[PDB]
Amino acid sequence: MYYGISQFSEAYNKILRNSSSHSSCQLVIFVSCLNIDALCATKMLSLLFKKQLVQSQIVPIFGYSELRRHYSQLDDNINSLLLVGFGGVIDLEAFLEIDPQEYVISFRRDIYVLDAHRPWNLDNIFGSQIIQCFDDGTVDDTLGEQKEAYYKLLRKQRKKQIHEYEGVLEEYYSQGTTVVNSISAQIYSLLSAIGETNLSNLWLNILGTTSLDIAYAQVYNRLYPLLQDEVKRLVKTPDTLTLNIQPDYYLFLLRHSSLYDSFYYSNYVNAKLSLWNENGKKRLHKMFARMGIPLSTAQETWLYMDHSIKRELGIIFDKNLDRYGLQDIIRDGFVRTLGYRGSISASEFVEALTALLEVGNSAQKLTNLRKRWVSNFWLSWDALDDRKVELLNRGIQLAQDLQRAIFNTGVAILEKKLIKHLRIYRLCVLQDGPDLDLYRNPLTLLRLGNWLIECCAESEDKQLLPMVLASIDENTDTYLVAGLTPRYPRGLDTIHTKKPILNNFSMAFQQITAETDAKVRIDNFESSIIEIRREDLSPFLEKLTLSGL
Amino acid sequence: DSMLKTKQSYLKLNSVENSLNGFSHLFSKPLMKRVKKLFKNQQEFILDPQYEADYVIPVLPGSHLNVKNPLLELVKSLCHVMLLSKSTILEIRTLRKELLKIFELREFAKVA
């Protein structure tokens, strides 16, 4: 590894040696927009660097083109640069044409890449001293064999060694893009090693680690015990700030919407009981009756809903949910209370943040979209502090609205049966329908796809196939396409969890674009999302069908 | 040739005129099969670089339409030339709808 976890603080010291000045902004940070873990890590870093009065600047970017342009905008006065949430799996030197001899003086301007994606560039690690990263603990063990060939390859019978090295490099490559650790986890580990831990840092660490529950439950289960132990290690006066381990359930805004709507919109219950047709609603009403809560009572706000059954809810769930088999809905989570203001939980808060990111407030229109994305990111950032709650109530209500719209579109999709089952991968295209303008956002599209893949998994089908989903915006006449991996049922044992399902869509897309002259634009930091032309879609799809996946 | 043949047959027999009515029954199925084959080949080889020469839409003085798929204009012209009958409208319209069903389009669409 370059920087092991046992030396992070040293790198911190280096920053103080180079950037701590009086009247010179000598540190700029690039953040992977449209990501929650990056935002949490950036907030932690901003607080830390405000503590020691180190002047700094935060810059949000959306695509690699903006990265290149803003790097070209940089000046040599910047001794240290930060990149968080991206830039791990590509060689920046070949990307930003860094001349090692231009910067040697040492190499002057240091750049700190901090990301999590595991198929990250080997040359970008072992070949450059200008570029330097924070390994999570992957190189020391996993890459114990790949680095040997690179070191060797950086009288007619020696071609066997070259062939072996080439084969080793090829075997290392051609793997899916995955995430195995959280950025905020490493940031909090550095904070703990230094000695600057407090309740705000713990809250931000919890947010960062819990933003991955949707997609990386394995990572979440690996990381939970450390959070539990740390929160254990660390009269209701109006200044109480309590962090608790309270039971919580996989429910959409349980503490801000009625229990009926919570069950109705919860994705897990949807998948388990098929609430998009009539039998699902009948089974839901049967469940409510057998629990014994009136249908008029269960449709009241959580504040005013009856205190006795609020107390008895746990026992009611324990005694009733077994018949329908929904007992995997009960888990243990974190709750934050601030005096007399109320109560909130991590899941609700991250859903509010995600919705606020989604909704807030040819080339020209694309630039306008990419700039309003940054504006929404900054609004979400400002929403973090405890002095503002009117930027959180709005987020909660917008989350409700967005989930309703997603459910309304998904029921139509599953009713029309647009999901075409090919030989290898499923496909569905939203040619026409309602509210299509919302799905121009990659995160909204991912939310829709997550619900769809959950629904598909929660069936009797025994085939795990990648899914391809497309949209349309008539203004640009382009299709936005995202590739989605299959997911195991949540209530599954860990023995069949040797390796997470990888994602080869980025490799397939890049190979097809290299071999044919399609009119695509691959600039998202998420390499599994591309933009394509309406007339160019179908042959492209054919190619993807005929290519090796 | 088909129109000549049907007019000759009608004359041999002896706003509608049976001189031409029923002439499209001669070449329907081969035309449909050929259109399907053309569509498949165009789908297969449209994005190839070395085959990009033969799909280039020529530019001429007075040209103002900007359109993408060549087979669409081929079939559109081949149908508009038949539609001039003014007496066999319905048969031509059925054939045109059947042709458009090969693509994922609709009978009264703007692009058609």
Side-chain angles (χ1 to χ4, degrees), chain A residues 2-6 8-9 11-16 18-49 51-146 148-152 167-168 172-221 223-225 227 229-310 312-386 388-422 424-457 459 464-497 500-518 520 522-525 527-533 536-542 544-549, chain B residues 1-51 53-85 87-112:
Chain A
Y2 186 79
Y3 282 130
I5 55 182
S6 55
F8 284 171
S9 49
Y12 175 47
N13 304 328
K14 289 185 63 171
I15 310 161
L16 269 297
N18 301 7
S19 285
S20 187
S21 181
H22 181 271
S23 187
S24 177
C25 182
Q26 298 184 2
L27 176 59
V28 186
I29 314 168
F30 291 136
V31 303
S32 165
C33 187
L34 312 185
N35 198 295
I36 302 302
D37 195 24
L39 183 139
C40 297
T42 301
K43 188 67 174 178
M44 295 177 71
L45 265 295
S46 165
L47 291 166
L48 200 158
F49 291 165
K51 189 150 200 196
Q52 285 92 17
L53 311 182
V54 177
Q55 296 187 83
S56 180
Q57 177 198 27
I58 296 99
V59 172
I61 58 173
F62 172 63
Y64 286 120
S65 50
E66 288 298 281
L67 160 68
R68 285 178 178 265
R69 186 260 178 273
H70 291 314
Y71 188 98
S72 87
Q73 190 54 42
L74 286 191
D75 174 41
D76 55 49
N77 189 31
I78 310 310
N79 297 331
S80 306
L81 183 71
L82 282 189
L83 272 62
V84 287
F86 59 90
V89 304
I90 60 174
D91 172 36
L92 274 298
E93 266 185 314
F95 208 83
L96 309 174
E97 54 262 16
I98 297 98
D99 191 2
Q101 279 73 24
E102 171 67 29
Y103 288 162
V104 64
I105 196 162
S106 64
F107 307 103
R108 204 180 74 183
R109 173 197 290 161
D110 286 304
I111 302 176
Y112 295 162
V113 62
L114 182 52
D115 205 15
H117 298 81
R118 274 302 72 84
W120 85 103
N121 193 296
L122 193 145
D123 194 350
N124 196 1
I125 294 308
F126 294 116
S128 297
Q129 300 296 280
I130 186 69
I131 300 304
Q132 63 186 356
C133 73
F134 305 82
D135 182 19
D136 76 279
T138 298
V139 179
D140 51 339
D141 43 353
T142 76
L143 302 194
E145 187 60 41
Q146 321 285 1
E148 173 198 323
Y150 181 82
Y151 283 139
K152 289 193 310 191
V168 165
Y172 173 77
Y173 275 75
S174 196
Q175 295 181 9
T177 57
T178 52
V179 179
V180 310
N181 192 359
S182 175
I183 304 166
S184 65
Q186 289 142 4
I187 293 306
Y188 201 78
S189 177
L190 157 69
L191 267 293
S192 65
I194 292 305
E196 305 282 329
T197 62
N198 53 4
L199 285 184
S200 307
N201 291 331
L202 172 54
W203 184 240
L204 293 165
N205 180 17
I206 278 164
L207 286 187
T209 311
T210 196
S211 83
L212 304 186
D213 191 0
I214 299 305
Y216 306 99
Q218 186 56 42
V219 167
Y220 193 70
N221 274 249
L223 286 186
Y224 196 73
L227 283 171
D229 292 331
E230 205 281 339
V231 74
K232 183 190 305 151
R233 193 190 65 82
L234 285 185
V235 57
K236 205 204 300 175
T237 188
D239 300 336
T240 52
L241 193 151
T242 292
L243 270 187
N244 267 15
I245 300 171
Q246 302 182 359
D248 54 342
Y249 320 101
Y250 293 64
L251 289 185
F252 182 83
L253 288 181
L254 181 56
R255 293 170 173 80
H256 292 256
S257 62
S258 78
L259 177 55
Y260 179 66
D261 308 309
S262 178
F263 280 164
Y264 181 59
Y265 282 121
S266 65
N267 301 352
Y268 184 45
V269 169
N270 172 295
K272 272 299 308 177
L273 287 186
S274 293
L275 281 73
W276 45 277
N277 61 359
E278 203 72 19
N279 301 123
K281 305 178 48 51
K282 298 295 185 290
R283 277 176 297 265
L284 173 64
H285 278 92
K286 176 168 151 312
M287 178 172 140
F288 265 113
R290 199 179 200 283
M291 269 185 303
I293 312 181
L295 270 296
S296 70
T297 300
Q299 289 195 350
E300 284 214 354
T301 316
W302 178 265
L303 294 172
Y304 311 108
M305 196 217 77
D306 171 59
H307 174 74
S308 307
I309 59 172
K310 274 169 69 170
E312 295 180 354
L313 198 61
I315 307 173
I316 282 176
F317 281 171
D318 191 6
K319 70 180 285 215
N320 277 92
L321 285 169
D322 201 1
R323 175 171 289 178
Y324 309 87
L326 286 179
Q327 85 274 18
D328 296 317
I329 201 170
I330 296 171
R331 70 174 189 174
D332 288 327
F334 309 101
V335 179
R336 184 172 166 265
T337 315
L338 185 52
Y340 306 153
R341 290 44 170 163
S343 293
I344 202 60
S345 85
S347 307
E348 305 156 52
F349 190 77
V350 295
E351 301 320 297
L353 279 176
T354 301
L356 190 62
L357 269 179
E358 305 313 291
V359 186
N361 211 0
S362 169
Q364 56 275 20
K365 299 95 171 183
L366 193 62
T367 305
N368 286 8
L369 267 288
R370 290 174 181 203
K371 75 180 180 67
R372 66 93 171 175
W373 283 333
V374 181
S375 296
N376 292 319
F377 165 83
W378 265 123
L379 192 151
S380 158
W381 166 281
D382 288 331
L384 275 167
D385 56 352
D386 285 342
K388 319 295 298 312
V389 286
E390 60 269 17
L391 290 175
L392 198 65
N393 308 339
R394 193 157 151 227
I396 281 177
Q397 73 183 359
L398 289 177
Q400 287 159 348
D401 293 347
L402 290 183
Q403 187 70 9
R404 184 192 318 288
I406 291 313
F407 184 89
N408 181 25
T409 297
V411 69
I413 290 295
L414 278 160
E415 178 70 29
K416 276 144 163 277
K417 307 272 186 172
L418 304 191
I419 296 176
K420 281 280 176 280
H421 178 287
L422 308 173
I424 302 301
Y425 70 103
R426 294 176 184 109
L427 160 67
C428 79
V429 181
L430 272 69
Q431 185 35 258
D432 171 36
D435 70 13
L436 274 179
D437 51 300
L438 280 72
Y439 300 73
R440 287 157 326 184
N441 195 287
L443 294 174
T444 295
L445 188 64
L446 269 293
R447 156 181 276 180
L448 173 64
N450 281 321
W451 178 37
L452 266 293
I453 183 61
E454 182 65 81
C455 168
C456 286
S459 76
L464 312 162
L465 311 185
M467 184 176 177
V468 171
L469 164 60
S471 164
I472 175 61
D473 47 348
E474 51 85 18
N475 303 294
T476 308
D477 198 0
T478 44
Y479 289 161
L480 200 152
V481 176
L484 305 177
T485 54
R487 274 202 314 263
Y488 283 113
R490 300 193 193 195
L492 271 192
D493 47 36
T494 59
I495 178 60
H496 191 183
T497 307
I501 298 169
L502 315 181
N503 192 4
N504 313 121
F505 275 123
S506 54
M507 301 174 27
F509 288 159
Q510 71 184 359
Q511 191 170 2
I512 300 309
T513 309
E515 77 162 67
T516 55
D517 47 0
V520 302
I522 314 172
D523 45 358
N524 203 31
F525 293 140
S527 51
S528 80
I529 295 189
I530 61 183
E531 295 187 33
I532 204 164
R533 298 291 295 178
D536 293 329
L537 173 80
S538 169
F540 178 83
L541 296 186
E542 176 63 29
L544 182 47
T545 307
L546 60 85
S547 52
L549 195 61
Chain B
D1 183 51
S2 167
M3 291 181 285
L4 191 147
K5 280 277 291 293
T6 180
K7 187 197 163 188
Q8 289 276 40
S9 309
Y10 169 74
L11 282 189
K12 180 81 176 316
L13 193 142
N14 308 64
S15 307
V16 296
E17 50 185 358
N18 287 64
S19 300
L20 277 297
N21 279 296
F23 76 102
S24 78
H25 292 335
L26 305 188
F27 59 92
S28 172
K29 274 64 60 174
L31 170 59
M32 293 302 294
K33 196 134 53 177
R34 185 69 170 163
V35 168
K36 285 171 185 276
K37 185 63 64 67
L38 272 171
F39 178 57
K40 189 160 66 70
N41 265 13
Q42 186 199 260
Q43 159 203 21
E44 192 177 352
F45 294 149
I46 176 72
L47 279 73
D48 275 331
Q50 87 262 32
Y51 301 149
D54 61 2
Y55 300 127
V56 162
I57 287 175
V59 60
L60 294 176
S63 58
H64 58 266
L65 77 167
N66 194 2
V67 67
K68 307 295 191 293
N69 212 4
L71 209 70
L72 267 298
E73 298 89 36
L74 169 72
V75 298
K76 271 162 60 180
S77 54
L78 205 59
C79 277
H80 172 75
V81 69
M82 280 197 258
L83 188 149
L84 310 159
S85 178
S87 76
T88 76
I89 290 290
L90 263 68
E91 196 178 1
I92 299 303
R93 296 299 276 235
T94 48
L95 200 40
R96 174 170 163 270
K97 193 192 80 170
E98 177 51 47
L99 275 161
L100 273 182
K101 206 156 285 297
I102 306 301
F103 307 141
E104 304 301 327
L105 291 177
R106 314 202 210 101
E107 185 182 359
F108 281 77
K110 307 306 290 292
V111 76

